[PDB]
Amino acid sequence: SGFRKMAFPSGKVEGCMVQVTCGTTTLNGLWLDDVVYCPRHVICTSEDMLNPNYEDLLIRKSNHNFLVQAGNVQLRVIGHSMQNCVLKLKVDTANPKTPKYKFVRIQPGQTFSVLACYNGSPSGVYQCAMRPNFTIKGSFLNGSCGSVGFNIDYDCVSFCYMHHMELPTGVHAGTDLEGNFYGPFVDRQTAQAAGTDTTITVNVLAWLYAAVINGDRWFLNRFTTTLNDFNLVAMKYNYEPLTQDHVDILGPLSAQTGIAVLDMCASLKELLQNGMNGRTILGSALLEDEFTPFDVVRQCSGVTFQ
Amino acid sequence: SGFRKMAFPSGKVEGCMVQVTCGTTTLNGLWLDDVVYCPRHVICTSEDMLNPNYEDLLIRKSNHNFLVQAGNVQLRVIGHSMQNCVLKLKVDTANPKTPKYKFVRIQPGQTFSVLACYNGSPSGVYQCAMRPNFTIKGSFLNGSCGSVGFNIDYDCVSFCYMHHMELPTGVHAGTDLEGNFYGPFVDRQTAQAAGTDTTITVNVLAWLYAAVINGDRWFLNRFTTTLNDFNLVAMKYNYEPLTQDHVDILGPLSAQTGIAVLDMCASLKELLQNGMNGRTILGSALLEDEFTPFDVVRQCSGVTFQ
Ligand SMILES: *[C@@](O)(c1nc2c(F)cccc2s1)[C@H](C[C@@H]1CCNC1=O)NC(=O)[C@@H]1[C@@H]2[C@H](CN1C(=O)[C@@H](NC(=O)C(F)(F)F)C(C)(C)C)C2(C)C
Numbered sequence: 349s350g351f352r353k354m355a356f357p358s359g360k361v362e363g364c365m366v367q368v369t370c371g372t373t374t375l376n377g378l379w380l381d382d383v384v385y386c387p388r389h390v391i392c393t394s395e396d397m398l399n400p401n402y403e404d405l406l407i408r409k410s411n412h413n414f415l416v417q418a419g420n421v422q423l424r425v426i427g428h429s430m431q432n433c434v435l436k437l438k439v440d441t442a443n444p445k446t447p448k449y450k451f452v453r454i455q456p457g458q459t460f461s462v463l464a465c466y467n468g469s470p471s472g473v474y475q476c477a478m479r480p481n482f483t484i485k486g487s488f489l490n491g492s493c494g495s496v497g498f499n500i501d502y503d504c505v506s507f508c509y510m511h512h513m514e515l516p517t518g519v520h521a522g523t524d525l526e527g528n529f530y531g532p533f534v535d536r537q538t539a540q541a542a543g544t545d546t547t548i549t550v551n552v553l554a555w556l557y558a559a560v561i562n563g564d565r566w567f568l569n570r571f572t573t574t575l576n577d578f579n580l581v582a583m584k585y586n587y588e589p590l591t592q593d594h595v596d597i598l599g600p601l602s603a604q605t606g607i608a609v610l611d612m613c614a615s616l617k618e619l620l621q622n623g624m625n626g627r628t629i630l631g632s633a634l635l636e637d638e639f640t641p642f643d644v645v646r647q648c649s650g651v652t653f654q
Numbered sequence: 655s656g657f658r659k660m661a662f663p664s665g666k667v668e669g670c671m672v673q674v675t676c677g678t679t680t681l682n683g684l685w686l687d688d689v690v691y692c693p694r695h696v697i698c699t700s701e702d703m704l705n706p707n708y709e710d711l712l713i714r715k716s717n718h719n720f721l722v723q724a725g726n727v728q729l730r731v732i733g734h735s736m737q738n739c740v741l742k743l744k745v746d747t748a749n750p751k752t753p754k755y756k757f758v759r760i761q762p763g764q765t766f767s768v769l770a771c772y773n774g775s776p777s778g779v780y781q782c783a784m785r786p787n788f789t790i791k792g793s794f795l796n797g798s799c800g801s802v803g804f805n806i807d808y809d810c811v812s813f814c815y816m817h818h819m820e821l822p823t824g825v826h827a828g829t830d831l832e833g834n835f836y837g838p839f840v841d842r843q844t845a846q847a848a849g850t851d852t853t854i855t856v857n858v859l860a861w862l863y864a865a866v867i868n869g870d871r872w873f874l875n876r877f878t879t880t881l882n883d884f885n886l887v888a889m890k891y892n893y894e895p896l897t898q899d900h901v902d903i904l905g906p907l908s909a910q911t912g913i914a915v916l917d918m919c920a921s922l923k924e925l926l927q928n929g930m931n932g933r934t935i936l937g938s939a940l941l942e943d944e945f946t947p948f949d950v951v952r953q954c955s956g957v958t959f960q
């Protein structure tokens with residue numbers, strides 16, 4: 349028992365991190381097989397960042413201008429191209445620690461671990477959600493760019509995020525590994541703000557199931573509700589609509605605890621209308637929405653990797 | 655900017671995890687050089703656990719009775735001894751992935767990462783505090799025993815915790831790596847409960863500094879206080895006394911933000927007496943006490959390892 353914000357083991361991803369330098373800009377890169385992936389703004393100076401023309405800056409560079417280091421070792425670059433907001437540097441050495449991997453684009457509400465890095469070295473790991481407004485609530489400093497987010501399935505690392513920038517209110521924005529941004533952000537120092545965020549309703553419900561599994565059951569009431577009535581209430585508290593797919597995805601947890609999803613929905617509705625009245629759930633005073641149904645199952649059933 | 659519960663990168667520790675089986679009991683072990691460390695209760699049956707005589711169970715075993723596996727590979731045991739509540743199995747193969755390491759015993763209030771494992775494989779990693787009452791607030795299931803907690807300093811892994819048991823209220827208890835328990839717990843299924851816990855005052859103060867660093871400054875008042883007056887108030891809200899050593903340890907953060915420790919103490923005193931009045935600090939509705947001063951600095955200044 350116990351329930352924590354748990355990150356995936358970071359080892360397989362630690363073995364892929366390198367430092368990429370172009371002039372006086374240094375940031376992190378991800379070395380898979382014989383390719384290094386990093387943010388394209390590695391090619392920018394201080395003066396380039398209001399409105400850079402990346403294609404123009406890139407044509408002016410050749411292979412040798414890119415200093416890639418893996419620990420003590422410099423990797424010789426032998427090719428370079430740009431894909432969306434990412435740069436791919438072909439190198440002459442395949443990374444022997446490359447794990448089985450894929451590139452995926454996640455959906456809003458999905459969680460992943462971030463391996464925060466500086467100078468190609470790891471600072472730490474933490475779990476995050478892709479927010480409905482396409483930001484993440486990260487912890488990133490200058491030099492964190494090229495840090496990645498990922499999920500693990502048995503032996504396979506799915507890379508879903510590469511870090512690029514910080515937006516107003518200290519939230520974060522970045523790309524998939526093909527260099528396409530999550531949300532309408534661009535990689536230039538210009539005025540940009542995330543839209544209003546919302547609560548990821550299905551995740552709140554998954555965490556309420558986790559609470560029942562851990563014996564924290566005071567908020568369960570004796571009612572049910574329809575999906576329609578529930579969704580009218582949720583909408584007023586800035587909660588995402590719950591879809592039938594969300595209901596289906598909650599099925600394992602429902603089946604395990606014996607509590608129908610629509611009954612849990614009646615219990616959440618009461619929480620939203622009445623507040624928690626100074627009580628906690630799993631040690632928390634606020635409803636948490638950064639655990640997915642799958643995150644709850646893996647934690648509570650002891651799913652392992654590697 | 656941003657502030658998260660960040661765990662150390664787990665790779666160096668992932669490379670040391672193995673599975674130890676003795677009869678039908680399987681749990682996790684830590685393979686450093688040519689020695690495997692695991693909880694001694696690996697030698698127990700179901701019927702042994704109310705009141706086991708470990709020394710008696712152990713004399714009945716020989717080397718070959720211990721099945722140690724590292725992935726696909728079985729490690730041949732060539733010696734065994736017991737140290738306090740830990741078993742040391744000498745094996746014929748040195749772990750080539752052994753990092754530089756030490757065994758340390760931490761003090762109450764200190765944080766560390768836990769690499770939760772089942773069958774010698776990692777489930778996830780999370781940050782924890784050794785509580786004043788010598789429990790940790792973990793997330794552990796059956797089979798998690800032998801999971802370890804650690805800190806990293808540059809390249810050196812300091813192992814401070816090995817997991818043994820779960821106590822009432824779903825908190826956790828375990829040993830240092832010489833097999834001595836934190837707190838007055840014993841490794842037998844008998845009635846045991848942790849004493850009343852308290853809040854780790856110095857950590858709450860470190861997290862308040864983190865909030866100011868991140869621009870969350872609404873709770874700062876215009877007063878100071880003496881250490882004595884502060885400690886009388888803290889005592890009533892079940893906060894640990896703040897010592898002069900705690901004040902000294904907070905010095906970097908104080909110096910960075912420009913806020914004297916005793917002024918931050920005046921601000922915390924107001925929080926304890928008046929509550930937070932429905933506001934959050936760094937997204938939290940409760941005061942957090944599982945970040946140390948060092949955890950705050952490393953996160954906010956981007957300290958890396960490996
Ligand atoms: C990233 O680590 C790095 N970016 C550069 C760089 F452009 C040149 C040299 C070295 C580095 S490292 C960095 C991560 C940020 C810094 C603070 N927290 C982070 O997450 N990214 C940026 O600095 C980034 C790059 C230029 C401006 N950037 C921003 O993050 C800015 N944000 C925006 O302008 C906004 F998002 F639009 F709001 C900033 C600096 C926070 C104001 C570019 C987007 C290319």
Ligand SMILES: *[C@@](O)(c1nc2c(F)cccc2s1)[C@H](C[C@@H]1CCNC1=O)NC(=O)[C@@H]1[C@@H]2[C@H](CN1C(=O)[C@@H](NC(=O)C(F)(F)F)C(C)(C)C)C2(C)C
Nearest residue numbers: 679695794795796797798799818819820821841842843844
């Ligand atoms: C641990 O993973 C394992 N212990 C055994 C074992 F003894 C025999 C075979 C296999 C395993 S695996 C396990 C971790 C626990 C289980 C639930 N959450 C955890 O953190 N430890 C125990 O089961 C442990 C061992 C016997 C009884 N144990 C307890 O944790 C019990 N607690 C207590 O009796 C109390 F702490 F005193 F309260 C239990 C099972 C939670 C009631 C012993 C202490 C040797």
